[PDB]
Curated annotation (Swiss-Prot):
Belongs to the AAA ATPase family. Transmembrane segments: none annotated. This is ATPase family AAA domain-containing protein 2. It is found in: Nucleus. Interacts with ESR1 and NCOA3 and these interactions are enhanced by estradiol. Interacts with acetylated lysine residues on histone H1.4, H2A, H2B and H3 (in vitro). Highly expressed in estrogen receptor positive breast tumors and in osteosarcoma tumors. May be a transcriptional coactivator of the nuclear receptor ESR1 required to induce the expression of a subset of estradiol target genes, such as CCND1, MYC and E2F1. May play a role in the recruitment or occupancy of CREBBP at some ESR1 target gene promoters. May be required for histone hyperacetylation. Involved in the estrogen-induced cell proliferation and cell cycle progression of breast cancer cells. Residues 108-130 form a coiled coil. The chain holds residues 981 to 1108 of 1390 of the full protein. It comes from the Eukaryota. The gene is ATAD2. Residues 3-114 form the Bromo domain. Induction: Up-regulated in breast, uterus, colon, ovary, and stomach tumors. Induced in breast cancer cells overexpressing NCOA3 or treated with estrogen. Down-regulated in 5-fluorouracil-resistant derivatives of the colon cancer cell line HCT 116.
Amino acid sequence: SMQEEDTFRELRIFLRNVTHRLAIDKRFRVFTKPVDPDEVPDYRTVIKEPMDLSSVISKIDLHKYLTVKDYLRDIDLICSNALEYNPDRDPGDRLIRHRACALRDTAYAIIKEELDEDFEQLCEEIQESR
Ligand SMILES: COC(=O)c1ccc(NC(=O)C(F)(F)F)cc1
């Protein structure tokens, strides 16, 4: 229905706003673009499904997300990829892991504050019906 298409348009507006607020935070610069294959040739042999905030924006516009649960799987993948690729005790790896955990925690906190649980439930029931 037209009303269901309006629901998914409001979801996209909400997800673009959350993603922009993450992408402008200085702590999260390393997560804003894909890893450069020239500077890190081993990245795509270790990490099987790369993800970053520019690709998340592209996916919103391609209508890949029908629920906030769908979106948070990709935020969780940005964080888990960083923890997997950078697991050592040295300061550069510990700084990237701290920032990845802060990206995940910040996204979940904005959603807890600003997503209506009945809006999410409506998106999930339309998705289930298709
Ligand atoms: C999400 O970002 C990453 O997981 C990540 C980014 C860069 C590098 N490495 C270099 O820049 C290098 F090789 F030049 F030291 C390692 C991991």
